[PDB]
Amino acid sequence: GNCPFSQRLFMVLWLKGVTFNVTTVDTKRRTETVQKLCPGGQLPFLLYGTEVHTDTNKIEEFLEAVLCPPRYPKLAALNPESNTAGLDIFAKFSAYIKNSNPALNDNLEKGLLKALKVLDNYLTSPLPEEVDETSAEDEGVSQRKFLDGNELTLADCNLLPKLHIVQVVCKKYRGFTIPEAFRGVHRYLSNAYAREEFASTCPDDEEIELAYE
Amino acid sequence: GNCPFSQRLFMVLWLKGVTFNVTTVDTKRRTETVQKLCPGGQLPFLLYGTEVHTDTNKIEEFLEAVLCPPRYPKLAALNPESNTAGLDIFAKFSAYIKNSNPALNDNLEKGLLKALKVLDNYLTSPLPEEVDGVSQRKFLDGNELTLADCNLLPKLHIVQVVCKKYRGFTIPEAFRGVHRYLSNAYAREEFASTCPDDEEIELAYE
């Protein structure tokens, strides 16, 4: 499976309150170390067509259990749906970007769009906690910042690195962007990119670009 | 390999300032979590005779790299000898404790004693930082706990506990280096608070 020393784990650490030094020297030392620890590859692998969408990170499980309340905040989502929202996106991305037959590109692109749209609908439908909240402009449209509410959870730690990779690699190598009509996905990514826990653990475009040549 | 979610790792965490609540209930939950993560066993495995003494903990290496200065203290030892001192004690122990033949016991014990003595000599010999004689430093590499201590101390402690219970064997008082090292370690909560009790150890190797 995937290298467990990943942006997902970095986000978990930062959200637990265990932050890193934010310098290029630290980025390099971290990257070199993870290269040693995960010689087979450090960013999440592309999936094959029939693969289930699980991606267990044992170190994440350890940290959530042992770095726990009261000393550390609990990061697990409250709504089970949050833990599966968008999970198929990296898979649809994988099939789309691995394909070099132009004849299959349209069906595969639509597959990725459709999985994005499913996420968008999750992001724009109210969660239980929102039942008596008032939407800003359109009745019954969710305005929460992240998957499970207004706080980052474990579910966001897995999804956002992957979504960010999808965006960088598709933009670079296909000229594909996530439609602006997916307002929930764009709000989500905008709120995420504004959080140091995501932005400071983000690999620069060049590391992502080179990873997926 | 050995379960990476170990006393060694917990020591590293506490030495970086990432601590935990230590009540019998919190400790029990952590133990349970690690059993789930490492069903095969949680304490370091006994070695086979031909096995090299390497014990790579990738999560430890990761933590040292990322939880680094200026925000956190560096824990890597400065003297390379620190990282190999006593690495063979767990292997000598393994040979000694696995043997069931009373006729071979005395000379396996000699091997274990000899390995403890090599460590004792390292601990009593001044490091380069101490030069102009007996060393007064507390730990392998100096007066601060390092990653090297995080590996060695859990293992040395298990050797002490198990050997005392199943062989009536103790580290001679005369190995002052070793005794002072263990005393100084037991006086630090980063070790004590992450240490399984004697029954958990004894029963794990029974």
The DSSP line for A59-70 is: HHHHHHHHS-TT
Residue in B with minimal Cα distance to A56:
B37
CA distance B22 to chain A (A): 11
CB contact under 8 Å between B20 and A58, yes or no, is no
Residue from B137, B149, B15 nearest B85 by CA: B149
Can you tell me the distance from the alpha carbon of A151 to that of B149, in angstroms, rounded to the nearest whole number? 39
Q: Which of B60, B66, B72, B147 should we substitute to test contact with A (largest number of A Cβ atoms within 10 Å)?
A: B66
What are the structure tokens assigned to B156, written together?
């040395």
CB contact under 8 Å between A37 and B20, yes or no, is no
Residue from B19, B94, B8, B20 nearest B58 by CA: B8
Which SS3 state, helix, strand or coil, does residue A101 take?
Answer: coil
Scan residues 56-95 of B and list those with Cβ closer than 8 Å to A.
Answer: 58-59, 61-62, 65-71
Contacts of B108 (CB under 8 A, 6+ apart): B92, B95, B96, B99
Contact A189, A120 (CB under 8 A): no
Chain A environment of B70 (Cβ under 8 Å): 21
CB contact under 8 Å between B20 and A62, yes or no, is no
Can you tell me the distance from the alpha carbon of B151 to that of B75, in angstroms, rounded to the nearest whole number? 12
**A43 assigned to a ligand binding site:** yes
Can you tell me the distance from the alpha carbon of B205 to that of A121, in angstroms, rounded to the nearest whole number? 54
Can you tell me the distance from the alpha carbon of A166 to that of A90, in angstroms, rounded to the nearest whole number? 7
Q: Is A185 exposed, middle or buried (0-12, 13-18, 19+ CB in 10 A)?
A: buried
Can you tell me the distance from the alpha carbon of A146 to that of A154, in angstroms, rounded to the nearest whole number? 11
Cβ-based neighbour number of residue B206 at 10 Å: 8
CB contact under 8 Å between A21 and B62, yes or no, is no
Question: Cα–Cα distances in Å, from B48 out to B53, B91, B96?
Answer: 10, 8, 11
Contact B67, A20 (CB under 8 A): yes
Backbone phi, psi, residue B76, to 5°: -60, 135
Q: b/e per residue, A122-150, with b = 16+ CB within 10 A?
A: bbbeebeebeeeeeeeeeeebbbbbbbbe
Contact A45, A96 (CB under 8 A): no
Total length of chain A? 213
Cβ-based neighbour number of residue A151 at 10 Å: 15
Can you tell me the distance from the alpha carbon of A183 to that of A188, in angstroms, rounded to the nearest whole number? 8
Rg (CA), chain B: 17
What is the largest distance, in Å, between two alpha-carbon atoms of chain A?
55
Contact B166, B108 (CB under 8 A): no
Residue in B with minimal Cα distance to A201:
B66
CA distance A33 to chain B (A): 7
Does residue A70 have a cis peptide bond before it, meaning omega lies within 30 degrees of 0? yes
CB contact under 8 Å between B62 and A20, yes or no, is no
Contacts of B64 (CB under 8 A, 6+ apart): B12, B74, B75, B76, B147
Cβ-based neighbour number of residue B189 at 10 Å: 12
Residue from A61, A34, A24, A20 nearest A196 by CA: A20
Cβ-based neighbour number of residue B205 at 10 Å: 18
Ordered DSSP codes for A184-201: HHHHHHHHHHTSHHHHTT
Contact A70, B20 (CB under 8 A): no
Question: Between vectors from CA A172 to CA A114 and to CA A166, what angle results, nearest 5°?
Answer: 40
Can you tell me the distance from the alpha carbon of B37 to that of B57, in angstroms, rounded to the nearest whole number? 15
Q: Does A29 touch chain B (CB under 8 A)?
A: yes
Can you tell me the distance from the alpha carbon of B86 to that of B140, in angstroms, rounded to the nearest whole number? 10
Can you tell me the distance from the alpha carbon of A194 to that of A150, in angstroms, rounded to the nearest whole number? 13
Taken in order of first residue, the domains within chain A and their CATH numbers are 1-76 (3.40.30.10), 77-213 (1.20.1050.10)
CB contact under 8 Å between A20 and B67, yes or no, is yes
Residue from B150, B167, B50 nearest B113 by CA: B167
H helices of A4-138, where? 7-16, 24-37, 58-66, 89-98, 105-124
Chain A environment of B62 (Cβ under 8 Å): 5, 33-34, 37
Ordered DSSP codes for B121-161: HHHHSPPGGG-------SBTTBSS--HHHHHHHHHHHHHHH
Contact B124, B176 (CB under 8 A): yes
**A56 assigned to a ligand binding site:** yes
**B3 assigned to a ligand binding site:** yes
CA distance A194 to chain B (A): 22
Name the DSSP class of B42. Answer: S
Q: Which of A21, A27, A29, A57 should we substitute to test contact with B (largest number of B Cβ atoms within 10 Å)?
A: A21
Q: Does B21 touch chain A (CB under 8 A)?
A: yes
Can you tell me the distance from the alpha carbon of B52 to that of B81, in angstroms, rounded to the nearest whole number? 17
Report the 3 state secondary structure along A118-170.
Answer: HHHHHHHCCCHHHCCCCCCCCCCCCCCCCCCCCCCCHHHHHHHHHHHHHHHHH
Contact A26, A32 (CB under 8 A): no
CA distance B91 to chain A (A): 25
Can you tell me the distance from the alpha carbon of B109 to that of B124, in angstroms, rounded to the nearest whole number? 22
Name the DSSP class of A46. Answer: P
Q: Is B90 exposed, middle or buried (0-12, 13-18, 19+ CB in 10 A)?
A: buried
Q: Does B121 touch chain A (CB under 8 A)?
A: no
- The H or E element spanning position A205 is helix A205-211
Considering CB atoms only, which of B20, B21, B58 is closest to A37?
Answer: B58
Can you tell me the distance from the alpha carbon of B172 to that of B174, in angstroms, rounded to the nearest whole number? 5
Can you tell me the distance from the alpha carbon of A53 to that of A63, in angstroms, rounded to the nearest whole number? 22
Q: Does A210 touch chain B (CB under 8 A)?
A: no
